[PDB]
Amino acid sequence: MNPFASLTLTTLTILTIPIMMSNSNIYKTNLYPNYVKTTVSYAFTLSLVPLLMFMHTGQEMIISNWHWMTLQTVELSLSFKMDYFSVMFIPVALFVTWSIMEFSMWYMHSDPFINRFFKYLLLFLITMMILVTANNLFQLFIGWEGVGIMSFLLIGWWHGRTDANTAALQAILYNRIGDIGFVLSMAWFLTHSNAWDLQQIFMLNNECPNMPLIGLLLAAAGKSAQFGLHPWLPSAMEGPTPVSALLHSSTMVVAGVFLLIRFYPLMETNKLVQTMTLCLGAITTLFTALCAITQNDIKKIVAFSTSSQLGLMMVTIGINQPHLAFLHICMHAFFKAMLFMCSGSIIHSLNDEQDIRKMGGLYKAMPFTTTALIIGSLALTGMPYLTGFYSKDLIIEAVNMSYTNAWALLMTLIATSLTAAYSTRIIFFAFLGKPRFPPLVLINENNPLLINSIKRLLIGSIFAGFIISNNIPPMTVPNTTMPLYMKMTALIVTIMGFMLALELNNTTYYLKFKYPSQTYKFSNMLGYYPSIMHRLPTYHNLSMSQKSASSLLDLIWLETILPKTTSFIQMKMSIMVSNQKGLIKLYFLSFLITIMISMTLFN
Amino acid sequence: HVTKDMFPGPYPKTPEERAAAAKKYNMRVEDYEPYPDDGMGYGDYPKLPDRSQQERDPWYDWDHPDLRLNWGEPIHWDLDMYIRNRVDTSPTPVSWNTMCKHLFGFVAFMLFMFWVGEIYPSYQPVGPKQYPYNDLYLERGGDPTKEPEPVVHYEI
Amino acid sequence: MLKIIIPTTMLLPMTWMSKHNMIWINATVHSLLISLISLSLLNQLGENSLNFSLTFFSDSLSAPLLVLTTWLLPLMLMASQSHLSKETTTRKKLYITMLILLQLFLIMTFTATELILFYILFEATLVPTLIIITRWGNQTERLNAGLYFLFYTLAGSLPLLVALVYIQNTTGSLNFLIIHYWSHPLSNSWSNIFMWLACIMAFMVKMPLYGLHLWLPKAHVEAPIAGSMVLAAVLLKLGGYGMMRITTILNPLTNYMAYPFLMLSMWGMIMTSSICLRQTDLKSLIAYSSVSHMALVIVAIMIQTPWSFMGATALMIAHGLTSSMLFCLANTNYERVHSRTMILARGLQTLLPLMATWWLVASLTNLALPPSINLIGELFIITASFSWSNITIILMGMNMMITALYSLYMLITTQRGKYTHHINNIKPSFTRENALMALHILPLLLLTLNPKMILGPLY
Amino acid sequence: AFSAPAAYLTHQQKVLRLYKRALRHLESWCVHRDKYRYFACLMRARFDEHKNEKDMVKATQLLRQAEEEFWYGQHPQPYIFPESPGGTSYERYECYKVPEWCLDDWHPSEKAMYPDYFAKREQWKRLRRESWEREVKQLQEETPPGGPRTEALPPARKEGDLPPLWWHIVTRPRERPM
Amino acid sequence: SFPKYKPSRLATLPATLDPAEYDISPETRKAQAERLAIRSRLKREYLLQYNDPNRLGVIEDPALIRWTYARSANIYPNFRPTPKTSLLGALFGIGPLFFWYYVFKTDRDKKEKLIQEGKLDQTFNISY
Ligand SMILES: CCCCCCCCCCCCCCCCCC(=O)OC[C@H](COP(=O)([O-])OCC(O)COP(=O)([O-])OC[C@@H](COC(=O)CCCCCCCCCCCCCCCCC)OC(=O)CCCCCCCCCCCCCCCCC)OC(=O)CCCCCCCCCCCCCCCCC
Numbered sequence A: 001m002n003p004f005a006s007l008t009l010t011t012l013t014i015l016t017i018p019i020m021m022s023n024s025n026i027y028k029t030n031l032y033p034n035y036v037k038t039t040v041s042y043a044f045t046l047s048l049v050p051l052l053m054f055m056h057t058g059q060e061m062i063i064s065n066w067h068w069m070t071l072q073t074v075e076l077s078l079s080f081k082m083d084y085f086s087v088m089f090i091p092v093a094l095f096v097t098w099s100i101m102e103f104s105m106w107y108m109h110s111d112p113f114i115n116r117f118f119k120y121l122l123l124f125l126i127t128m129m130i131l132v133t134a135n136n137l138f139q140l141f142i143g144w145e146g147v148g149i150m151s152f153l154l155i156g157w158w159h160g161r162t163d164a165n166t167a168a169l170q171a172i173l174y175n176r177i178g179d180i181g182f183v184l185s186m187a188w189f190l191t192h193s194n195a196w197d198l199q200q201i202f203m204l205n206n207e208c209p210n211m212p213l214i215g216l217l218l219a220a221a222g223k224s225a226q227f228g229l230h231p232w233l234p235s236a237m238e239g240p241t242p243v244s245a246l247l248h249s250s251t252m253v254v255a256g257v258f259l260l261i262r263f264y265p266l267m268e269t270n271k272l273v274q275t276m277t278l279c280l281g282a283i284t285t286l287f288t289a290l291c292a293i294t295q296n297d298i299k300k301i302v303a304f305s306t307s308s309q310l311g312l313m314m315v316t317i318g319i320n321q322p323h324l325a326f327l328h329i330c331m332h333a334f335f336k337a338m339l340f341m342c343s344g345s346i347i348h349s350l351n352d353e354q355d356i357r358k359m360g361g362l363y364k365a366m367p368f369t370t371t372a373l374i375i376g377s378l379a380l381t382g383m384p385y386l387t388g389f390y391s392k393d394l395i396i397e398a399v400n401m402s403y404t405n406a407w408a409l410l411m412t413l414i415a416t417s418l419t420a421a422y423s424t425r426i427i428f429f430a431f432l433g434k435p436r437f438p439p440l441v442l443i444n445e446n447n448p449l450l451i452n453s454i455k456r457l458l459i460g461s462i463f464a465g466f467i468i469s470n471n472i473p474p475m476t477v478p479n480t481t482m483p484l485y486m487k488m489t490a491l492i493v494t495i496m497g498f499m500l501a502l503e504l505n506n507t508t509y510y511l512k513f514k515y516p517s518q519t520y521k522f523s524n525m526l527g528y529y530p531s532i533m534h535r536l537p538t539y540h541n542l543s544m545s546q547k548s549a550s551s552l553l554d555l556i557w558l559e560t561i562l563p564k565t566t567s568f569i570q571m572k573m574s575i576m577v578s579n580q581k582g583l584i585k586l587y588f589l590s591f592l593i594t595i596m597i598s599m600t601l602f603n
Numbered sequence B: 001h002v003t004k005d006m007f008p009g010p011y012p013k014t015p016e017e018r019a020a021a022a023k024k025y026n027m028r029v030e031d032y033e034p035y036p037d038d039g040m041g042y043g044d045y046p047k048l049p050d051r052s053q054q055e056r057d058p059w060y061d062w063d064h065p066d067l068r069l070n071w072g073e074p075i076h077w078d079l080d081m082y083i084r085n086r087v088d089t090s091p092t093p094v095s096w097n098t099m100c101k102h103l104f105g106f107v108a109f110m111l112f113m114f115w116v117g118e119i120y121p122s123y124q125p126v127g128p129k130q131y132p133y134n135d136l137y138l139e140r141g142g143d144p145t146k147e148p149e150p151v152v153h154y155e156i
Numbered sequence C: 001m002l003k004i005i006i007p008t009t010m011l012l013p014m015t016w017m018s019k020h021n022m023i024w025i026n027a028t029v030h031s032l033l034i035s036l037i038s039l040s041l042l043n044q045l046g047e048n049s050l051n052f053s054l055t056f057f058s059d060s061l062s063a064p065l066l067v068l069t070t071w072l073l074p075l076m077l078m079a080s081q082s083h084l085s086k087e088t089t090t091r092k093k094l095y096i097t098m099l100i101l102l103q104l105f106l107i108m109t110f111t112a113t114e115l116i117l118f119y120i121l122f123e124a125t126l127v128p129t130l131i132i133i134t135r136w137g138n139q140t141e142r143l144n145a146g147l148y149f150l151f152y153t154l155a156g157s158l159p160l161l162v163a164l165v166y167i168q169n170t171t172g173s174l175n176f177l178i179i180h181y182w183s184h185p186l187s188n189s190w191s192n193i194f195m196w197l198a199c200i201m202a203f204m205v206k207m208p209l210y211g212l213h214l215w216l217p218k219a220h221v222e223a224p225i226a227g228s229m230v231l232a233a234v235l236l237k238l239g240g241y242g243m244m245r246i247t248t249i250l251n252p253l254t255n256y257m258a259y260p261f262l263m264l265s266m267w268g269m270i271m272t273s274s275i276c277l278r279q280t281d282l283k284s285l286i287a288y289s290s291v292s293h294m295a296l297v298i299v300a301i302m303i304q305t306p307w308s309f310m311g312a313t314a315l316m317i318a319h320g321l322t323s324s325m326l327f328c329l330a331n332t333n334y335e336r337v338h339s340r341t342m343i344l345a346r347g348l349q350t351l352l353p354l355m356a357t358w359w360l361v362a363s364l365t366n367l368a369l370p371p372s373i374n375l376i377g378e379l380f381i382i383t384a385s386f387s388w389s390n391i392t393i394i395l396m397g398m399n400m401m402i403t404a405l406y407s408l409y410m411l412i413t414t415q416r417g418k419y420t421h422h423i424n425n426i427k428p429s430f431t432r433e434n435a436l437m438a439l440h441i442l443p444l445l446l447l448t449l450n451p452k453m454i455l456g457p458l459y
Numbered sequence D: 001a002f003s004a005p006a007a008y009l010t011h012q013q014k015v016l017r018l019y020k021r022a023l024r025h026l027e028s029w030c031v032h033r034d035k036y037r038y039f040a041c042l043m044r045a046r047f048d049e050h051k052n053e054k055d056m057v058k059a060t061q062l063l064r065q066a067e068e069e070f071w072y073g074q075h076p077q078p079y080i081f082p083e084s085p086g087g088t089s090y091e092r093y094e095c096y097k098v099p100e101w102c103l104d105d106w107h108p109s110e111k112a113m114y115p116d117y118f119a120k121r122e123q124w125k126r127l128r129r130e131s132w133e134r135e136v137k138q139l140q141e142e143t144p145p146g147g148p149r150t151e152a153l154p155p156a157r158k159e160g161d162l163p164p165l166w167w168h169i170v171t172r173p174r175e176r177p178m
Numbered sequence E: 001s002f003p004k005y006k007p008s009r010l011a012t013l014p015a016t017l018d019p020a021e022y023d024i025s026p027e028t029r030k031a032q033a034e035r036l037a038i039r040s041r042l043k044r045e046y047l048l049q050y051n052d053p054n055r056l057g058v059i060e061d062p063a064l065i066r067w068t069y070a071r072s073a074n075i076y077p078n079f080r081p082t083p084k085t086s087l088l089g090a091l092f093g094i095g096p097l098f099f100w101y102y103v104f105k106t107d108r109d110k111k112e113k114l115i116q117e118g119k120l121d122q123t124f125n126i127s128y
């Protein structure tokens, strides 16, 4: 039959062979990480073929290979959707994972359980590939939960650390809050459309009601860390830097956005859910950029940048532009993965130090990391003809040229300013000044693994936007004509952010000191959202679950009602009946009374 | 190896049994204080300060360093609620009321302004997008056996 | 059906005439063989049933429960081998006799074409469990637990008996087939309301219902490991099987009468899930989790739709396996530490890594991770409830969140963190314990490959 | 950590703790080295102004305004060394720490590898077995009646003596066991 | 002067802002000395049992036993039917049940009325 179908299934299948060999002898040797890396590279170069076929003719398939249980009129089968989104995202994710694994062989070299780390990385990749290619809601739920469990296991990688376990349970909690909406959507779609299959859902819903779309939006908000459910993504930086670069930066966290992309035929028929998506994205991007511009942990800054980018993706979905959101996912993967890789290089060279107050002049001390981070920041802020340009410029133009909320547009523009601001914050505080790290200089970049893994994603961050944008077919009408100023809005906002943040950073050299303002405090403690919301509800829950449910009802009143009352009643009745002093006088008096009662009562 | 006299008992009423209970829990009689004698089954158990375990000294050499407890000390009634994995009560740089006011103020202002932007949207100086064949009647829902009212688009 | 019953009876003479050091080997081998024999009742029909004789019949609701019941005995023998080592030969043989008698009663209970025969065996199961709890339990509370476990049950079961004989005086038969084919609507009357209550409360107390669930934490915490295994895996499912069997004659009165039980279940699942969050005892926590899952099963049976029944069957099987595994893991910890308190022995992943893997898999399957059969049952029940009323999704989602929370809390408290310093008697895990965990867990992941085997007669 | 705590902190201990904490938070505010040096000299001059004060009531009235001022301007995100109780690698390597008694449960085929290590191990175990029975008596005779008042332990006072309760201090796993 | 810090239940008072630590009196110092003496006696007992080469098991903790027993088995003998206890029990154990019953009964009554009227649009609703 057609080759296109075989290649798509072979990529996913050969991704699983190292998991099968995890019980073999190679898992006991030091060659296992290289084996996993080689497998992932081969899968990437094999998956490049269906992408070429789609770029040529646009080949599309559904592969329902295995029939799993059938539920009366509902048939469940193992089915894979190999549309443009799948055949475009699979090579990008495989490329990013290849670079991340090559980086990890240098970053996690001293870790005793490095084979288990790679086994874990591969399991996450498999679950994410299951999530992306799923054709029905049950398989997509399988991938949804698998990536969550893998993130739980990889955040709490150092399980002797209390904060790592706290962060892992936090991620699980917020993702279950989203899973409520996911399960609501599944129940609605089965009850009304009689299917979890995507084709039947699209066919039978010409005008989709509010409830299933609101469930989908809740699931997306949970898994993409939108404003109501945001803190778990910054808290997830407890895991090793490769985990932060792969899962919580570019691949797993876009899953929620991808879900809204996967259901876009139904989303475009509902104005209320579109408006909710747009507003949620706008508030998320603004709030997370505002938190970012004042952080001191470099990984925290990059995580807040990731959350802002996800909010921008949600804004793009809310303005009814799903393909542009997918393109942003693909571009952000490249440059944000490289950003975390550069951050991890800095952290390793400075003896596991993550605070920017203790890193000074690294522009010359370690120059390949410097140039890679500069390129990544220029791609992130949006510099013409780089990878981030071909997506973000169109995002801003589309939001400007659309019938949207004025508040959402304003928040998006301010978030672009703040993106430039925290990018220049990282550069200024980590590369420009005098050194502020301890005297024993252990700075070293000379490892082929680190250099090669970073430079592959550097070439990606330079050219992938141009190549992909020029190879995919047009999926939307262009915004050909604009006012000149409104065409230049993104660049002027970015320049204003750069200049104002640079000016405000240059005053730290002055010999004057003053106490901070309330705005600074609000920005630094993350709007105080993690404080209040991680102390007030939890306490009130836990306290209640011991005071009322456990002690008041279960240990006291439910015990008082049935068993204790019965015991008391029977005890008193027994004590009354048995307590006779053995005086037959009283016995025969009772006999006379009952004799006369029997004579006067039953006749 | 624990005797009958080493278990929690009923609420202490006299100073002598109060001192005996304080002795049972390896704490000073002055420092001992039971829960108020209400219907709740607290009985004879010390009401320790409501501080979390995150507030305990991390530089002290505890017998249980991760939980920050010593072997013989009395255990807070709600220990499992304060275990550094859960709710903590550590002092913050900003007051609780101030944080509540600011967080609440921000969220409410954002919601109000989103509503306002809904009332006052943004758009461009253009009319509706025009589509050729009766606004794509056949391609959007169909029903070819109805012949709807034609719509003619204006050349300008 | 005698091809299963007779070998189970022959297990007794084989046990009592065994050598002093050969009882465990022989019992385990022949119990595994009986399980293999019973595995051929899974070949069910889309037609009525496998009506072997006038006394016993098989169903695709009965067959998975029968297979689970047979499979549980070898695991119980393996789990009981350790703590009964210093025991006399006669008393070990008596313990094995109690286990075999309980299996025989359960096997005959699940086939039992008659409602009176079902009642007699359903109550006959009460005696060996009571003896096991009150005789080979460690604490002083076991006696009290037994009392509770007894009287609760009888408090619900004596009215049922009365109702049962009453029905035969009016219908003329209590055979399931004639009862099903000749069913007539139940009028909305006071007499019929009390007949409905008499028919339901016996199975409701054994699930247990949220209001009537107090006996279960006592009985599970006090019982030995095999007692806990059989209580959590099979004995809780007798109520579900009985309700599914008997609700055929209770229509249309179930529509009105189900409301109090539906509210009790939907709120008590939240209540018991939250109780699990503040629990200092592993066995008590696992018992409360069982109460939550059986609350969901009660909701499924009361809704009384095809998807409800399929989900209830799947969830009963999955919970039986998962809860038995959880009790076995907690018991492996207890046999080392002798405390049974969760906070005491900590950081066991560093000292026992493979057992930490077993803990992780058991917590994941209790958490209802797809595509496990736990989640298949959960999702089918949730969809049926959503069709019943769209507002149930709130309580179902809260229950899912709290379930994930306490499952991972139990995993993290015992396996993660720093080891307790003064505990130095933690030995490497035995081949027996690892094999016990594997024999619990591999059947679950195999059943997820063929779910229709555990989806019941409405599949 | 290693040293035993006292019943209370003296006034000068409190002053020195405030000094260290204030300078640490000041360098958290003053990122650059020269700015921090300047403002740290200013802070030291501000501290040593009341250095020779003899009124203890007025000195205790001081340090209270000082701690209130510190709490007002305390840099809500101070710098923490990575392995300190708030740092990013505080308890990172606790999962690699295994007790020394675990080696007693190794299979003989495992102990067949590393024979010299295990021989030294029984040397240590014999040393412990004798020293302990001596240490219990030494601690019993040295401890005041009514129980210890401070959790400080005595040194070895004889020739063949070992410090009492030395085993679990000497045989700590390691800072970086793997 | 500077803006005041106000403590709360979930954000307690800092140690260095307590008026108590700066009010030193001989009785306070004596109380601190006895607290340290109790802690040191407990620590000595624990370390004596901990460093013992002959000990091969769990060091039993009476404090932990008391904690678990108080949490579990001492509740009911210390229960007293009190207006506070009775009202809280009735509220927390009955009110949610009736609240949910009212909600679900209203929802299902509306659904049943709609389905009788025929204006529910149950097309493609095959599985229940
Ligand atoms: C239409 C015409 C278009 C053109 C328009 C004009 C173009 C631009 C003009 C510029 C206008 C202003 C730009 C200045 C930015 C501020 C910079 C500054 O001075 O900061 C220092 C100063 C204090 O710093 P510090 O305490 O001394 O810090 C000590 C060290 O420096 C510690 O320092 P550090 O080392 O730790 O870190 C430094 C960090 C720390 O600095 C901070 O403290 C961060 C906080 C300030 C930055 C926030 C700017 C954006 C705010 C967005 C808010 C959205 C609405 C939120 C609603 C909240 C209300 C409750 O600062 C930074 O990282 C750089 C700042 C980023 C700014 C660069 C780009 C953003 C400017 C964009 C403005 C709008 C143009 C958008 C472009 C597109 C046009 C549509 O900040 C302030 O005083 C705040 C000023 C503005 C904050 C507004 C919020 C006030 C809310 C009060 C309540 C109001 C009532 C609400 C009603 C409620 C009803 C219930």
Ligand SMILES: CCCCCCCCCCCCCCCCC[C@@H](O)O[C@H](CO[C@H](O)CCCCCCCCCCCCCCC)COP(=O)(O)OCC[N+](C)(C)C
Binding pocket: C188, C189, C190, C193, C209, C210, C211, C212, C257, C260, C261
């Ligand atoms: C404790 C832990 C859990 C245990 C199990 C709890 C579950 C048992 C709950 C019993 C289910 C409900 C019982 C009867 C339901 C019928 C509906 C009736 O009660 O409501 C109205 C009935 O009105 C009044 O309710 C009359 C009954 C009032 C007397 C009952 C006492 C009320 C509170 C007592 C609760 C104690 C329960 C436990 C006892 C030990 C309906 O109005 P009406 O149209 O006229 O009657 C229609 C029915 N007809 C046609 C047969 C006549």
